[PDB]
Amino acid sequence: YPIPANATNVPISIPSRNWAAFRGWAFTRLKTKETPSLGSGYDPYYTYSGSIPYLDGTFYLNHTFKKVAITFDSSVSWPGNDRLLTPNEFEIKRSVDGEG
């Protein structure tokens, strides 16, 4: 899902469909320059032949994550059923606001 420079707001846009097999969620980060949207032989995007995250587990920008809050029926969040400290948000990191 490509995302521009200095922006912080991007969700997934998928409506009602099939879900019959699901173990859970997984997410990592990768550059557009080193590898493109695959499916083609030699597409007009290659130009970095360096170490690609999608091959050797070469991921690195996996520390650059703030919150990934889930929604299950386009109204209530997946922690809605109050299980965590935060009611809805999946805070991966919070830099110095409540040491607790």
Binding site: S16, R17, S75
Partner: protein, 171 residues
């Protein structure tokens, strides 16, 4: 007509009423026919599942009448627990008038014991109305199959089946 998928109801929570049914694909198996020795199995394992979702549809809920009603009374959908627990008071209602205004300031009761309690009901004042409250969605509309797609054009079709649909008018 021969190979359709079991239809799955799409949901909107705070309304209570389901939007409409849709087919499953992101787990649907390969239909590139393996051969004459497995075509009867891929059409056969599904066939008994079609009767699994058909039988429970009449058991879990009463058969379909109004396919999607917003104006919905409670019968199978459960009205929350009607049981109160009533406890007494440390101080009495009529044994307090004798003292404070006269002279003696006040700060089972170990002065003059009495037993008087009154219990009143906890139940929802009048019966449950509108959509499904907490969690009764699966027990109300179980995934059910129409195995012959749109067989009958002008009379009736799968009506409340569409998510872009209200009970008042079609379209």
């Amino acid at each position: 007509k021969e190979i359709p998928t079991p239809y799955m109801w799409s949901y909107q929570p705070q309304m209570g009423l389901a939007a409409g049914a849709a087919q499953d694909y992101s787990t649907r198996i390969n239909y590139m026919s393996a051969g004459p020795h497995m075509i009867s199995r891929v059409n056969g394992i599904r066939a008994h599942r079609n009767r699994i979702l058909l039988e429970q549809a009449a058991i879990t809920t009463t058969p379909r009448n109004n396919l999607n009603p917003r104006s919905w009374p409670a019968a199978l959908v459960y009205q929350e627990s009607p049981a109160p627990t009533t406890v007494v008071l440390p101080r009495d209602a009529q044994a307090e008038v004798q003292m404070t205004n006269s002279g003696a300031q006040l700060a089972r009761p170990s002065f003059t014991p009495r037993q008087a309690i009154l219990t009143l009901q906890t139940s929802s004042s009048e019966p449950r109305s509108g959509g499904i409250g907490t969690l009764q969605f699966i027990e109300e509309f179980v995934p059910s199959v129409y195995f012959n797609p749109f067989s009958g054009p002008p009379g009736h079709y799968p009506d409340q089946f569409i998510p872009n649909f209200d009970a008042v008018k079609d379209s």
